[PDB]
């Protein structure tokens, strides 16, 4: 009960108006601070026990940030737009050894978001669903997170079918982007962990803390 898309949309609008890898990592650290603010703007998120808020964010940060810059890169030709204002072209990511994953982002996420014209409200609702992941281990009350997730996709579907009545399969189409997001998210972490192991590629304090244990 109570989970209006207006609040979600607002949270989205309020938080966002040489080696490519290094740039992406710096941009990731920068966005992590903004992610915390975004979350606090999501209804009922702050009413959860602190430990649980920490658990949800540490579990979804990577997929949450990917979803954000992917949607922000819809107008981009063959690349993505970083929160720092920098552009990473497909060829550049390829010349850095990250072509495979980069291409997956463009093909499975950026491209599809553009084809269906996913709007900010839809983006926000999907990130809210990711944030409220009831499968996160350690949650003091998983059932509670489950309820929030349900209220979110309930408002999301309502939003759809009303704004896009002509597209009855839209709601399902948005949800079916999550499997790809989960996969891409898992792959980016692996790369990050390898970068941290090799030592190269400067990793800031916030990004580094997310790469902690568990």
């Amino acid at each position: 009960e109570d989970m209006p898309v207006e609040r979600i949309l607002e949270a989205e609008l309020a938080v966002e108006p040489n080696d490519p890898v290094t740039n992406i990592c710096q941009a990731a650290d920068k966005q992590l601070f903004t992610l915390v603010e975004w979350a606090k703007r999501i209804p009922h998120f702050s009413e959860l026990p602190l430990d649980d808020q920490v658990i949800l964010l540490r579990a979804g940060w990577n997929e949450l940030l990917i979803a954000s810059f992917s949607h922000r890169s819809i107008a981009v030709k063959d690349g993505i737009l970083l929160a720092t204002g920098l552009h990473v072209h497909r060829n550049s990511a390829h010349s850095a050894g990250v072509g495979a994953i980069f291409d997956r982002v463009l093909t499975e996420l950026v491209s599809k978001m553009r084809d269906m014209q996913m709007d900010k409200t839809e983006l926000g609702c999907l990130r809210a669903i990711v944030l409220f992941n009831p499968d996160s281990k350690g949650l003091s009350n998983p059932a509670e997170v489950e309820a929030l997730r349900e209220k979110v996709y309930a408002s999301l579907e309502a939003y759809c079918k009303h704004k896009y009545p002509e597209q009855p399969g839209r709601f399902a189409k948005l949800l079916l982007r999550l499997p790809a997001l989960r996969s891409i998210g898992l792959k980016c972490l692996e790369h990050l962990f390898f970068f941290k192991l090799i030592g190269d590629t400067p990793i800031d304090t916030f990004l580094m803390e997310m790469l902690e244990a568990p």
């Binding site: 915390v36 606090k40 920490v54 964010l57 304090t205 803390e209």
Partner: peptide, 11 residues
């Protein structure tokens, strides 16, 4: 554990 994150979520 999770020093930074907690501080930000608290304020």
């Amino acid at each position: 554990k999770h020093k930074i994150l907690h501080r930000l979520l608290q304020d």
